Amino acid sequence: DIAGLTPCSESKAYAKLEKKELKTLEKRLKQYEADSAPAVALKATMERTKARFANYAKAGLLCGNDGLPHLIADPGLALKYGHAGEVFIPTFGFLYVAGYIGYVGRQYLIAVKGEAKPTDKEIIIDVPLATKLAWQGAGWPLAAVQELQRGTLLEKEENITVSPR
Amino acid sequence: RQSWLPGSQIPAHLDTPAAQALAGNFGFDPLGLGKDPVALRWYQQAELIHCRTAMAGVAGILIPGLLTKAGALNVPEWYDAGKVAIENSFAPWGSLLAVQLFLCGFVEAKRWQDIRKPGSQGEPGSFLGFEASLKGTSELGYPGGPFDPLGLSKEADKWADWKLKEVKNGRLAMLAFLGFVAQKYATGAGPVDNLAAHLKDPWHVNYATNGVSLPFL
Amino acid sequence: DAALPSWMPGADLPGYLNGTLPGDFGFDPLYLGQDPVKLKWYAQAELMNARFAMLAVAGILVPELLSNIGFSWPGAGVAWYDAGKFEYFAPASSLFGVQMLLFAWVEIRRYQDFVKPGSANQDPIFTNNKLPDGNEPGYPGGIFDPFGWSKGDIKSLKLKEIKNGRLAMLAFAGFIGQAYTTGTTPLKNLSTHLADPWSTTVWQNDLARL
Amino acid sequence: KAGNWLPGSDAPAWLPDDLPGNYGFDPLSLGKEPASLKRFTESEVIHGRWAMLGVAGSLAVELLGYGNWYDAPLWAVNGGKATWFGIEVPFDLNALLAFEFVAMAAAEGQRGDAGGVVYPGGAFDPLGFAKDSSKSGELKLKEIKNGRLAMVAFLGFVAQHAATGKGPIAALGEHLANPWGANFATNGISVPFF
Q: Assuming Cys at both sites, which of B58, B211, C118, D91 could form a disulfide with B173, CB separation 3.0 to 4.6 Å?
């Protein structure tokens, strides 16, 4: 398909790698009993390996000449060939959680900056205020867009210190 | 003062006289998204549009679906009506969507300009004389003229009640459509089918037994 | 809050029901008539629903009563719920359209008189024909009362009308319920119950299907 | 005023009493502003005149046995020649659009350049039926009423054709033959449940 790759469900190297992993696990299992802890652990690892290979092939991932899955980062190719779950959806997921953390921290700093000793609140975290801001940070994109549109997101150039050039 | 949580502290931005004039004010804003008055006004417009659109869609899904259960109609499921309608149609879905986007963009742009400047659509000599009727009322999101032909908004005594019946119903519709999606991804049948299946045996046919809503059980 | 008749002797009835409307017994546990405009609308709604239910119960009970005796006519054995799929001189669609137009005319005239009393008492074609000036919404009179029955005790007659209307509304609801449960005409259910009332009750009949 | 569209209702204050066909019908308050009322008045008179011409043409073409109004331009869809009163016309669809466009553009431009004139007179009234302004108001009422009736009739023509398939004259004969069996309620699309 994309970049001359082949789907993992049809790649021979993919199935060969799965057989190799199951073969080394079975070889290690051949030295133990049939109802012992190492045997059960090795069988669980084998089942996990089989489930992982079947799930990766079911997801529609593309495998190269090495039999390993390859990710598609281009939004056009990912949305046109059903690869948005690799790099697109996790991108927006990270953006949401990262902006969540940044917005909560910024709100906490702005909240404690108007007190008597903000540094004291910076070393000794005010748990009730932090918990309230952490719960209220779910609407961080809407609140951030509103702050940017009102002009309260940035600080004026005259209020920021600079070097003597 | 009706509240969404008896005993909870109502936010200060939802207790102002301007915010209290909005329909369905129950002091529900835990995230504090309506702290800014401009943002609150914009979200009020968004909620009104969502309420009306959800009411129209849920009605178009429920009424034909309920009539299909009986012998009145034969309308297919909402998740399959698009394919059935586009099969014996005169245009593909792309061309239809393009025409729809143009027609919807025109009226949405006019509504957007009215939101930015109330009554600005009444500019003389700009809409072939129909601009006089394009000026909304004193409340944003509630225009008159061509809209509201029966003139039920002229009576103020019921006005405050009418708005309360529009937002609340709309909110319910907004949840209904959401359920329509979740049920589609949990049972594989239509809403009327799910209602009948639950009415046949509610103690065993619910979201606690679908195997999706409770993966830990 | 007076000596007016009540639906519960001793109970504290609401104050917005002062006996002005006919058949006022202070029955409003859900407080649906708190708003004066809503109560004004509900009074007309109750009157219209009551009159239509009275006509319906009469038109359901009379053909079955005449069918059980020697009187015969084209539609006799057909039930009230089966009269829709009957062969008439015109199709059901045509009759539905004709009645929708006629009812649209009379209902818009009634609504016009409701929003403005005395503004629809004049006949549009014949300017000489008109209704008397003294009138109230929901009580037209004039040509609607050619016998002059309203010249007497209008309060007692209005009380009789609202009572009979409420009874007929409950009767129509019972007709729907009996037709949905027993699947038989109401007079047949009455005869079945009159044969042996101790073994033919709603509890026994509904328990036999559980 | 000409009358009251809704008996018992008060006429709007923005509708002049001397306006022809003033029944006080304006629930949407479209002609609230005086600038819009003038344009809408001229538009209504023009629409009434065009509708009268269209309805008269459709009725005459179907009554004279030359097809209905819907099948008139069908000659230029499958190959043919237009015929007026049974006489062949050698003008194809391409030459008709150009000549009609030029003629209509010139006539409408001349009419619109006058500043929105509804009753020009003079050359348009060679018989002088409205020379005096006393009887002008009465005839204007007849013109606007006939125009409104023609507009309603044309809308009925289009709706009944899209609902049944036959022409206006054929639909009238069918209704006269079977009134209860043939109406809008029996077409199958006006009333869905029945």
A: B58
